[PDB]
């Protein structure tokens, strides 16, 4: 079964990356800034791309921006698929990270959203939407490796399982793929073939000047990944953007 | 570029020192001596060490004593409202653990 909205969003975001076609800061000449940003990334072997929400707002009567805003968690994989093709088209040197080289895990980033919420304004109706938040940092965790994609091999026979997907808990295969063996136990995680990510936990509390009458400040836990770990510092004031999520009792 | 131009323009002035002293804590009437002291603390001295490895302190500590209604807390309020790295604490409502580390 296939989601048509995802494919149409994918190949519309593709066209935005191709031909946003803003004119120069000094002259009436088309500049194509996002293609230039891809070239810049190629020059410096970067892994993240920044997009302006105002540029997306004016595109195609705003429907694309609405779909990205209200259903970010559904559409984020399709946005990744859309960007991969464009980088292949104009800068295939960026697709890889001598023996063979694994693929680059690109990160899309957004800024200049219309409004900033307080920690006190987080409510369950907004789960999975795109938001921006501000507060004072009070604690930070050390950087830890998070398992992103896994690969296992069987003890009772020479067989391998690859690209197993994790979500919130450490997860392992359901069968031995070789039908000559039935053992489900004694898997081991191949640290060379599997892939990890950088992960950091930080904790924030409300701005003192914003607290309402007779009340006290609430707090929140925030997750940082990739090239943004250790950017935050205790006692500083920061502004964040991302999506709010819900975490189980593992 | 415009920031550099503005900074150069005020750097060139003959009367810069007096204007700087006069611009600390605008709401407080008089007490130019304390304002001058606050400016010099904010700028600070030069940190250094000797061949022996001993360090020489490069910064300035200040204390203000006064009888009531002398507006002495306004200086602390201005400093904590202005200086990029600063914290305000009350001697009654704080602990040694909360002051250093816990």
């Amino acid at each position: 079964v296939d989601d048509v909205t995802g494919e149409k969003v994918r190949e519309a975001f593709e066209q935005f990356l191709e031909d946003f076609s803003v004119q120069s800061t000094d002259t009436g000449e088309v500049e194509k800034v996002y293609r230039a940003q891809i070239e810049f990334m190629k020059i410096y072997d970067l892994n993240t791309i920044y997009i302006d929400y105002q540029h997306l707002s004016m595109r195609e009567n705003g429907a694309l921006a609405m779909a990205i805003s209200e259903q970010y968690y559904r559409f984020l994989p399709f946005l990744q698929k859309g960007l991969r093709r464009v980088v292949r088209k104009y800068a295939p040197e960026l697709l890889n990270t001598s023996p063979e080289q694994t693929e680059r895990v690109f990160q899309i980033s957004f800024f200049n959203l219309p409004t900033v919420h307080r920690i006190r304004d987080i409510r369950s109706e907004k789960i999975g939407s795109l938001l921006s938040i501000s507060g004072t940092v009070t604690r930070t965790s050390e950087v830890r490796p998070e398992l992103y994609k896994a690969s296992f091999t069987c003890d009772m026979c020479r067989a391998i399982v690859d690209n197993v997907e994790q979500s919130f808990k450490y997860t392992e295969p359901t069968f031995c793929p070789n039908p000559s063996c039935e053992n489900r136990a004694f898997w081991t995680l191949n640290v060379t073939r599997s892939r990890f990510l950088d992960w950091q936990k930080v904790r924030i509390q409300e701005n003192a000047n914003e607290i309402p009458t007779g009340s006290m400040p609430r707090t929140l836990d925030v997750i940082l990944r990739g090239d943004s770990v250790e950017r935050a510092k205790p006692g500083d004031r920061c502004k964040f953007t991302g999506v709010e999520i819900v975490v189980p009792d593992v | 570029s415009d920031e550099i131009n503005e900074l150069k323009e005020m750097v060139k002035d003959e009367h810069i020192y007096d204007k700087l002293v006069r611009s600390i804590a605008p709401a407080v009437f008089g007490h130019e001596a304390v304002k001058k002291g606050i400016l010099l603390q904010m700028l600070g001295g030069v940190h250094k060490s000797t061949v022996e490895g001993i360090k020489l302190r490069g910064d300035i500590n200040i204390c203000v004593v006064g009888d009531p209604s002398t507006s002495k807390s306004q200086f602390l309020k201005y400093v904590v409202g202005f200086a990029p790295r600063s914290v305000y604490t009350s001697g009654k409502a704080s602990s040694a653990a909360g002051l250093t580390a816990a």
Binding site: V1, I127, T213 | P68, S73, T89, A93, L99, A102
Partner: protein
Amino acid sequence: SEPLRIIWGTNVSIQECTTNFRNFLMSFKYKFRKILDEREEFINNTTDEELYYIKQLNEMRELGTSNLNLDARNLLAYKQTEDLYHQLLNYPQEVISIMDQTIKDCMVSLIVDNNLDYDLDEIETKFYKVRPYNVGSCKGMRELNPNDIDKLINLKGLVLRSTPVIPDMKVAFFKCNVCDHTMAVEIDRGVIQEPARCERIDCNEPNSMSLIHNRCSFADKQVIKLQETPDFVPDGQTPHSISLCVYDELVDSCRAGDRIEVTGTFRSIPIRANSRQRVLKSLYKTYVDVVHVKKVITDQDLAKIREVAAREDLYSLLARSIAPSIYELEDVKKGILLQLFGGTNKTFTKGGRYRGDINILLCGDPSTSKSQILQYVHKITPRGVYTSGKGSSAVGLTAYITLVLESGALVLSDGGVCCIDEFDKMSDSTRSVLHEVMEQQTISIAKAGIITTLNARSSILASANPIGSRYNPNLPVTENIDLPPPLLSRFDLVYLVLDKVDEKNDRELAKHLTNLYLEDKPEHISQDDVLPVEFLTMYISYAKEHIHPIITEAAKTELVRAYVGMRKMTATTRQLESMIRLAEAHAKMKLKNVVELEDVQEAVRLIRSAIKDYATDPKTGKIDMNLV
């Protein structure tokens, strides 16, 4: 004839409840309620004939809002719903649902029948909810019994604390691991109805579907802790508390120290012995499931307020009406009235913010009725606290580490008045806490694991007796009061009240107090003309919200002159600011937008009168008792 729908275990038919409530909703008019009320004479024939709920529904449509209040007495006024009133109390879960689906259908019917421009899809998308209230007599928290389970209840109390918002699941989302088919499933009775096999025809496989947490749908839940009011506690015992569960609209409504009345179903549930197994305990947990919360305008109100403000005797009228049964003490009453109004709050782009609040100290002889006055202020103010000197610690008065932070008296009292009695009994250690809160109206904290600053826009009203416990005329006034100068400098008004013997005074006082015992429950009151407490509260509240006086140049000249007069001779710089603040409070009380010469002169006069300055020896600082 046909199958029927029946509330389980009742033989009540849903058709009758639906039709009766529809008829009530589309034909009730306010005049019927006045028939149940004491007189037909009250009726305004023009207004009271109107279809009240149709008017409300039109407003809901055009204001874009989703909830309808309903006081249950109207169900008794209309003849067709006299029995529905009882059925509501006995079967709330079913009856309330019936009412909801009635209101939504009526809203649709209005736009399609009156053929209006509004989007039908928009109205179909929304949820509409009734919120019944004023159901009957309130019930004591300890007197709820196991025969009240699942019936509607009404409670009064005070709010202790609220937990943060909890996400509550409402719809589950499944996805097939092999073929990527998806299904949305409805949650009822807390159990997820997971499919046995993947429902796509060609992928009919077992264990094939799986849950996706962050594509589910959730709703807000919160728990509020309500405490028993002292009016109901048994003799020689301490108050109890009960927990309220609240959802969606009402979630963040209420703060610590609030005083409320609620309405909700009284529920009970089992609890498990361990998290591994289905074993339940024999005792059941109990709680309340609220559907409405209430705190304990018209052109006629504005007309009354403007007309009262035009009276010549207004200042004396308001002052003698805050505490009607207390004899004389007019200057004390006046100062307290100006504390109630307050100054104006000011904030600059730079140079800070300046307090509008007034601090008052009452000091003098025993039996002078100081503490009796504190009772009136504590009950008049919308928010506030009463406490005693030996009852208070430094932590309890401000804030408490518990890792979480918790509120004390001055924080609960924010925006209100904090009454402190036996102020002379608390230690110098505890009193030193008040310096920062009175000067700045903020509380700074720096302890293990917590460092922050909190707001405290709190007015202090204090009561004390002098050193030696009776005022000694052989010592100067500052030595009789005996507070240290850094703390005595922070009060806007300081009053001396003295137990001076005089036959003229004593006969009047004796006649006043003995007159209260001529009746069982007295109707007698000290004066012919006083305002009711409700209307007086309305006046003060409106004047606080709408009026914001400014300094006139004339007022500036008089303030400078007056300060130099008190100064040249001790008056500190705070005497100037407190004069400004008192003059502003006086201006609000007349509903003026400007401070004038008259207001400045009243502020000066009241300061001179409070500390008996005219009777003070200007050089020795002693008071001539003969001049009092």
